[PDB]
Amino acid sequence: IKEMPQPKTFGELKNLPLLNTDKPVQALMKIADELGEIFKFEAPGRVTRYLSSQRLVKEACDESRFDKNLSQALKFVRDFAGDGLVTSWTHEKNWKKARNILLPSLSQQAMKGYHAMMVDIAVQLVQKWERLNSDEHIEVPEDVTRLTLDTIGLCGFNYRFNSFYRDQPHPFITSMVRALDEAMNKLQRANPDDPAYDENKRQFQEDIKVMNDLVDKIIADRKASGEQSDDLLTHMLHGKDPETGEPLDDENIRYQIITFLIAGHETTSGLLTFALYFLVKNPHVLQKAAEEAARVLVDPVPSYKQVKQLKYVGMVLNEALRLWPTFPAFSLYAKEDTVLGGEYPLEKGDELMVLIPQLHRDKTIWGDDVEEFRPERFENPSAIPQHAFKPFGNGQRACIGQQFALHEATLVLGMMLKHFDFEDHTNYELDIEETLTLKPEGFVIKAKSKKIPL
Numbered sequence: 001i002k003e004m005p006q007p008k009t010f011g012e013l014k015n016l017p018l019l020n021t022d023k024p025v026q027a028l029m030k031i032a033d034e035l036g037e038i039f040k041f042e043a044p045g046r047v048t049r050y051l052s053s054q055r056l057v058k059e060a061c062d063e064s065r066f067d068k069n070l071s072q073a074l075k076f077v078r079d080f081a082g083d084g085l086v087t088s089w090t091h092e093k094n095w096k097k098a099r100n101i102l103l104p105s106l107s108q109q110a111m112k113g114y115h116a117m118m119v120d121i122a123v124q125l126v127q128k129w130e131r132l133n134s135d136e137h138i139e140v141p142e143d144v145t146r147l148t149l150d151t152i153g154l155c156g157f158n159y160r161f162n163s164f165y166r167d168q169p170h171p172f173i174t175s176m177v178r179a180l181d182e183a184m185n186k187l188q189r190a191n192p193d194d195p196a197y198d199e200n201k202r203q204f205q206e207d208i209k210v211m212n213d214l215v216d217k218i219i220a221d222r223k224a225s226g227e228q229s230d231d232l233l234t235h236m237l238h239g240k241d242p243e244t245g246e247p248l249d250d251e252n253i254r255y256q257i258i259t260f261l262i263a264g265h266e267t268t269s270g271l272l273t274f275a276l277y278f279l280v281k282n283p284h285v286l287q288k289a290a291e292e293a294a295r296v297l298v299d300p301v302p303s304y305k306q307v308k309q310l311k312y313v314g315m316v317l318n319e320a321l322r323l324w325p326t327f328p329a330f331s332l333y334a335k336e337d338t339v340l341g342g343e344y345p346l347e348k349g350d351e352l353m354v355l356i357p358q359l360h361r362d363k364t365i366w367g368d369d370v371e372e373f374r375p376e377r378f379e380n381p382s383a384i385p386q387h388a389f390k391p392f393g394n395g396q397r398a399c400i401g402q403q404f405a406l407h408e409a410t411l412v413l414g415m416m417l418k419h420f421d422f423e424d425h426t427n428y429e430l431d432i433e434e435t436l437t438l439k440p441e442g443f444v445i446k447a448k449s450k451k452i453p454l
């Protein structure tokens with residue numbers, strides 16, 4: 001039984017001022033670097049314990065001892081995502097129901113049906129890069145985000161955001177970013193319920209209205225075309241839970257549309273952006289990935305089966321998720337009084353946070369070269385210790401969109417590597433933007449077409 005490390009406190013503000021930064025996750029990593037595998041973090045009215053070692057994370061991932069917790073961030077996101085899948089408690093009726101109704105439409109088998117629409121958007125990105133003039137460059141997170149948003153829109157909802165027809169942000173995205181920013185900001189307010197912040201609240205309400213106006217158009221467009229489709233929205237609107245026999249109610253459907261539009265593009269856009277960063281910074285790896293893409297993608301557009309053969313591209317993505325998991329922390333609570341790691345007594349309800357990027361740098365698991373980009377670590381994933389690698393969370397509350405994300409990302413990266421040579425023309429220095437999720441900012445590259453037709 002041991003005292004838990006805790007960083008510097010600031011009187012009645014506790015540890016809160018340590019995260020007065022636009023990069024709180026990266027600040028927590030530096031605290032982990034100093035204090036080690038576990039530390040307590042307190043703010044007015046809350047306490048979390050951050051876990052950074054596989055030794056401790058493996059216990060937290062035991063579902064008989066810990067369940068998924070809504071972190072403070074997720075509680076603020078629930079102000080507009082309600083009891084959709086990401087922001088619902090495991091014990092809430094609508095979690096299990098929506099999980100049962102939606103899980104078949106996101107299986108590996110379902111990806112065979114989504115493939116052609118994923119290819120439609122991927123072809124749009126390739127054609128955009130082919131049409132740039134010689135003096136121009138690619139804004140990487142910008143174009144990738146255009147792709148991921150369009151992909152979830154079209155695959156999930158049969159709705160075209162038409163992101164490649166826009167050089168200005170889509171109104172939906174503007175409002176989403178502003179809502180997520182307000183959530184992130186609220187974390188750093190000692191008393192977020194203070195009247196002082198009433199302006200922030202009314203503007204938040206304006207951002208929620210904009211998002212809800214898009215949900216209205218998505219629903220109305222579906223009603224007007226008819227159900228000539230079997231997508232996520234079809235299952236939301238008409239599916240029934242086998243356990244209970246009930247469908248989702250109207251309010252829960254609306255939260256699921258919001259949930260899936262956001263969750264279904266933002267972390268994927270981060271992954272693709274990081275992957276490209278790591279490839280351009282590691283020429284030898286890029287070379288091996290490009291050779292795989294050239295050998296496998298022998299057709300003018302990729303088939304589903306070809307994407308499954310892009311093994312090395314898959315390993316590249318997993319190594320990007322190892323270094324920079326784009327949903328960077330998940331929360332748990334103790335189901336009962338217990339002791340963690342033989343050392344740390346917890347009460348029922350006590351919160352833990354898995355700091356995934358730091359977990360993924362545990363030298364006892366990965367060896368001393370933890371900071372290097374080496375896809376070959378994922379040559380034999382069976383050998384990786386249980387719960388060492390957790391970019392998609394844990395257990396029954398693990399990412400339901402994992403299959404979708406990896407199919408999309410593998411497909412798109414493969415196509416990029418087949419069609420273009422890339423140049424890091426500015427010698428970009430990694431700058432990671434946090435909007436709850438992680439993504440490189442300011443990353444620009446130039447492409448040289450290999451002039452392969454589509």
Ligand code: HEM
Pocket residue numbers: 068085086099259260263264265267268271325326327330331391392393394396397398399400401402404405
């Ligand atoms: C690289 C891409 C992605 C990453 C890194 C990622 C990561 C995660 C993580 C860590 C969780 C667990 C959250 C928690 O414990 O609080 C999660 C849950 C979830 N993700 Fe993802 N995700 C990705 C892509 C997607 C996609 C593409 C979709 C939708 C198509 C999606 C939908 C969800 C949903 C609905 C949940 C809630 C699952 C449940 O509680 O039943 N995610 N994701």
